[PDB]
């Protein structure tokens, strides 16, 4: 059962207004109850195969061959939105013949039946045309087209022209009866093109001027030569020509009497009766330079083709190469790929369950493009400041069984109004998924009654076909019921976070109760593993979506549910850790999409604690979003925002105040619950192994946290206490995160033993050495890396001169693991970790002491570290001095220039910053 909806989109418009109309339909489905029409209720209980839109009428083709039509009127436009006709009447079918295809022209409605008969119905006439002389003949031009001796299959209809095709590779075309005067030389009857032989034509799509035929592995076009190729023809039109235009929703034929020299202007055409207007030459095609032969489009070899639709801009195609999907726009001037675009989401989620649901919908020249993916949902397309596809914002819509749109022209416009003349009318037959809509409407009672009814039905009749059909239910962006519940559970306001800072509807609660009800459901137990281990269009599980969307109690509930389910299904291989990591953070995942890393880098945006001020920050630039000249963004914007974009850091940074909300939707303006965030960090530290995996910049979590702390200490001291809200405190989470992570013998071990043999850094040249000579592999495997460890030690000691607690935390963890005579192998492991850390501390201390003249705070911190670990620091300092004194005694010292010492401490820090804050050599691409 499906429901019918009407969308009015005035022309000319952008994709943003169309997306706003689709969104308005989406919340009218979601939060505005339900509404329909009396005469369309009979259409709701059947599978509508095809919907077409005429000038003032709409036609529906069903599965059983019944065709119905209705009238409508659209008043408002732009500087229910439609009025429907009172009664619906059907096609007279006393002969009992079912119908296969329908199509809409301006003056007639076309039908193709199973017996190969073409039927024509006038819009003005209330009864379909039947010839009295020939009872077996029904189309008035069937004799002229010569289709009476061949069974007919494929139809394509548009505003003025129609193109039709048999089984015998015979294609014909004609124009509407309102242009019968110029219909002597623009058309052709059924030929047999030898160039199209070899493969059956699988689809035909007609534009307003030309038409296209898609075969099994080729594309051909024929018809009117486009306006871009008229430059070479005039590389200048004499008077006396006869032309036609389709402007303002009406087709008209005129005659020229001026001489034309420049073709970029507008010309005045004398009107011709069907038995004197100023028209632009871009919408005028001279008839009395026509591509009467099919021309092959250039496509790459071994590429499957999915959906073809044509318009004035060219040929729009979806191409599949291997396991990848491109979107292509072909220009008819050269026949090559004019525009090539890659989808910003995953291709696997775009392919969906079935590849036959991918389609492209358009209505004419200026009409927009609606793309339908493999799941039957709408993929919203928009253009960024560059020439790519913007990141899509999901509409939360059910899949569409049938979609059809057309161009309508408004009637009797006043002369003193700026209302646009033309619009597009879109008709949707959206499916209903009742528990999906119950989840999206935030109602606990309907979900509870549905689960109780399903449990009673399984207990009584033992039927699970409806349940296994409901498991495969999807929303937009490849989202299941759990994904929809998580997306509903996102925080919206900052009221609780605003009120907790002092002296220091019911949608959310119903959503949480719904999540608990589906988590503790008895009947949903054998499918919750497949529900939780599913990836959406961004490649995230519901736990990853709850972490990234700042829904922390939802992530806590999902984590307990995964821990409960995973312990009862070990049995065979693919064991407990494999099931748990499949549910939490699966393999083949980007390192910047880890739940621990994302949980660490979700901080409050800097406009929330700085208004229109001009404090000193770090300034990032996006090429994609348009933050180019004076528009800027804070560092948390570069972390959470702009993750797949072309975002860079500018060295010449003046003062700015995060102009990120002006150009895009900043995802960091709202802070979630702090206690649930710390509890999630506590649970993720002691249950997974996500802390030993670096991010896409090759940084450990400890290095990222200490760099965030060292940046925020400098940035947050210029906060003055009293369009988005700017009355919140600066974020304090990274200090507590460092204090918790440093109390762990996995993170400290992986940080200190970084760059060793059993630790791979993706941005190091020594990581990928398997294709080299064996001697070079020996020379590269002799050494070990200590760049990032030295950077971490320098950032902990020199750049963190506002706290001491992290150093005592690290020293306490080291001493506690050194005094552990309980588990085997712990003591020597802690000894080696202590040796590596003391080597790094000794190197930093030596550099700082050489740079200073004849105590500073970092030297005091190094002395405290040496005093807390005396019997090993003495030996490592002996080794450091021995290494320093070797080249003097052997007389092989490298000559250097003299330098002056440092009287103050800021210049020594400036000189040691350039020595330790470096990067290893990247591998060869
Ligand atoms: Zn951006
Ligand atoms: Zn920001
Ligand atoms: Zn931002």
PDB file of C-alpha atoms and ligand atoms in Angstrom, residues 604-607 617 632-638 641 657-661 666 668-669, ligand 2:
ATOM      1  CA  UNK A 604      32.607  22.765  21.555  1.00  0.00           C
ATOM      2  CA  UNK A 605      33.055  25.159  18.628  1.00  0.00           C
ATOM      3  CA  UNK A 606      34.967  28.376  19.326  1.00  0.00           C
ATOM      4  CA  UNK A 607      32.104  30.712  18.373  1.00  0.00           C
ATOM      5  CA  UNK A 617      43.618  31.081  17.139  1.00  0.00           C
ATOM      6  CA  UNK A 632      37.658  31.302   8.632  1.00  0.00           C
ATOM      7  CA  UNK A 633      37.069  28.381  10.981  1.00  0.00           C
ATOM      8  CA  UNK A 634      38.468  27.121  14.281  1.00  0.00           C
ATOM      9  CA  UNK A 635      40.517  23.941  14.780  1.00  0.00           C
ATOM     10  CA  UNK A 636      37.607  21.811  16.004  1.00  0.00           C
ATOM     11  CA  UNK A 637      35.931  22.767  12.732  1.00  0.00           C
ATOM     12  CA  UNK A 638      38.874  21.265  10.846  1.00  0.00           C
ATOM     13  CA  UNK A 641      33.819  19.627  10.075  1.00  0.00           C
ATOM     14  CA  UNK A 657      36.198  34.422  14.885  1.00  0.00           C
ATOM     15  CA  UNK A 658      35.037  31.181  13.109  1.00  0.00           C
ATOM     16  CA  UNK A 659      32.853  32.133  10.160  1.00  0.00           C
ATOM     17  CA  UNK A 660      31.869  28.471   9.690  1.00  0.00           C
ATOM     18  CA  UNK A 661      28.132  28.777  10.392  1.00  0.00           C
ATOM     19  CA  UNK A 666      28.515  23.544  11.647  1.00  0.00           C
ATOM     20  CA  UNK A 668      29.939  21.467  16.641  1.00  0.00           C
ATOM     21  CA  UNK A 669      27.611  24.167  18.001  1.00  0.00           C
TER      22      UNK A 669
HETATM   23 ZN1  LIG B   2      34.163  26.608  14.651  1.00  0.00          ZN
END
